[PDB]
Design a protein around this ligand. Structure first.
Ligand SMILES: Nc1ncnc2c1ncn2[C@@H]1O[C@H](COP(=O)(O)OP(=O)(O)OC[C@H]2O[C@@H](O)[C@H](O)[C@@H]2O)[C@@H](O)[C@H]1OP(=O)(O)O
Ligand SMILES: [Mg+2]
Length: 171
């Protein structure tokens, strides 16, 4: 036992790894330097990954997020900010993917993944792929084509994990 030690990930490419896991359980076990949040521009951590991370910090992430946004104003779609990882990680990189359910520009998903290249190693979810309504296969593709640093993707759903791995390791 040490820190940033990932286990049970499938190596997709030289720098992209994928596991069927809860990003919160992975954060707790690994204590990564950086865990990524699938955030909105307001850092209102209502559901999905954001709700699960915030709940595991006993709401400390939401209190910090409320203070940050009241001070700085909202993020841009495709942007990020580095805040505390609380009890889960050294840092949390809050990254805003486009909300395609509200017609936001899918091109901003590439801008969102570009934020990952500022960090050597990240534990991350598939951006925009849940509540934000992007195709998860497309989100994995943009991740693989954009991110050059080491990214460990945690995919909660068993069936989604199997679909992502089979489509990737065919195409
Ligand atoms: N605990 C978890 N660990 C790992 N992955 C997780 C976990 N919970 C959900 N996911 C997955 O992450 C992906 C991203 O889903 P969301 O967390 O909904 O992020 P997205 O970028 O789609 O939506 C962001 C919005 O979701 C709101 O919660 C947040 O405050 C913001 O407004 C989906 O494939 C989502 O899968 P699903 O569609 O919820 O089954
Ligand atoms: Mg699901």
């Amino acid at each position: 036992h040490m820190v940033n030690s990932f286990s049970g990930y499938l190596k997709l490419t030289d720098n992209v790894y994928i596991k069927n896991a809860d990003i919160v359980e992975e954060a707790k076990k690994v204590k990564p330097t950086v865990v990524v949040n699938a955030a909105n521009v307001y850092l209102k951590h209502g559901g999905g990954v954001a709700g699960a991370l915030n709940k595991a910090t006993n709401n400390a992430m939401q209190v910090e997020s409320d203070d940050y946004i009241a001070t700085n104003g909202p993020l841009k779609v495709g942007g990020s900010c580095v805040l505390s990882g609380h009890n889960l990680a050294k840092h949390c990189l809050h990254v805003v993917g486009p909300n395609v359910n509200k017609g936001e520009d899918i091109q901003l998903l590439k801008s969102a993944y570009e934020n990952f290249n500022q960090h050597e190693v990240l534990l991350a979810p598939l951006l925009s792929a849940g509540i934000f309504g992007a195709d998860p296969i497309h989100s994995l593709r943009v991740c693989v084509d954009t991110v050059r640093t080491n990214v460990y993707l945690a995919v909660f759903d068993k069936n989604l994990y199997d679909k992502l791995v089979s489509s990737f390791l065919e195409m």
